[PDB]
């Protein structure tokens, strides 16, 4: 999903 | 040296929760450990075999998580290398191009940054707003 999110 | 394939998902989970809480230096440590565990198992497999490939694919998201921590703490040299390694095998990995683009920008490789952000857009046009922000920033700095 979001670029800053892990996984 | 094999009964810790079971540890990996737990370490992974603890890393993720640390990251979300803002404990990013410590999440990095967790991801690093999970990765070391997977690599050791992978060392026991023949490269290119199904088991080797499965382990490699389990490492990828963990290695990207680690790179994300490194972006936050402003250390770009591992991000460049780790992302390049992922991308040399899996050249459709959107997060890898994106993180590598950010790291390139941070260390003033404008051309290389633009190339990676371009690739992100080719693979996922839905990312135009975030990519445009990164590129806007970059472009301003190119303007001097």
Residue numbers in the entry:
A (entry chain D): 1 to 7
B (entry chain A): 172 to 315
From the study:
The TPR domain of AIP is similar to other TPR-domain proteins consisting of three pairs of anti-parallel helices and a Cα-7h. We present the structure showing the molecular interactions of the TPR domain of AIP in complex with the peptide-binding motifs of HSP90 and TOMM20. We found that the EDASRMEEVD (HSP90) and AQSLAEDDVE (TOMM20) peptides bind within the TPR-domain cleft and adopt a similar backbone conformation.
The structures show that the C-terminal carboxylate group and the C-terminal aspartate (HSP90) or glutamate (TOMM20) side-chain are involved in a series of hydrogen bonds that is reminiscent of the carboxylate clamp seen in the MEEVD-HOP complex. In the AIP-EDASRMEEVD (HSP90) structure the C-terminal carboxylic acid makes direct hydrogen bonds to one of the ring nitrogens of His 183 and to the amine nitrogen of Asn 187 and Asn 236. The C-terminal aspartic acid side-chain carboxyl-group also forms a direct interaction with the amine group of Lys 266. The side-chain hydroxyl of Tyr 190 forms a direct interaction with the main-chain carbonyl of the second glutamate in the HSP90 peptide. In contrast, for the HSP90 peptide, Lys 266 forms direct hydrogen bonds with the carboxyl group of the shorter C-terminal aspartic acid side-chain as part of the carboxylate clamp. The mode of interaction of these peptides resembles that of the HSP90 and HSP70 C-terminal peptides binding to the TPR-domain of CHIP rather than that of HOP. * 10-mer peptides were used in the crystallization, but only 6–7 resides were visible.
